[PDB]
């Protein structure tokens, strides 16, 4: 209109959510509980010698 140009109003997103990126250390000692559980049940068997004889 005349010399000036008119532009439409811009709609705005109401909310934003922040989810930052985190470094991944990738440690291996955690989630190894099964090995500890296996260590718990060694179960060495010893039979008395001389009771039979």
């Amino acid at each position: 209109c005349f010399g000036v140009t008119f532009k439409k109003p811009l709609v705005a997103e109401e909310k934003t959510s922040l989810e930052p990126q985190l470094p991944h250390l990738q440690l291996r000692l955690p989630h190894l509980v099964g090995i500890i559980a296996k260590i718990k049940g060694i179960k060495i068997e010893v039979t008395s010698s001389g009771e039979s004889i």
């Binding site: 250390l25 440690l27 291996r28 000692l29």
Partner: protein
């Protein structure tokens, strides 16, 4: 795992200083921790207190 977590501390230490430098640069100031500033005290002879200004 301990070998990794020992080196992670240096990464965090560098991250803090780099963030401070970014803030100073966005703020139109100078971070004198990252710059020497010892060469220009001899080129133009000024006192220690006059260099702080």
């Amino acid at each position: 795992d301990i070998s990794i977590m020992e080196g992670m501390f240096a990464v965090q230490h560098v991250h803090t200083h780099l963030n401070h430098l970014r803030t100073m640069l966005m703020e139109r100031r100078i971070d004198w921790t990252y710059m020497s500033s010892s060469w220009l005290q001899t080129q133009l002879q000024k006192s220690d207190d006059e260099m702080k200004v």
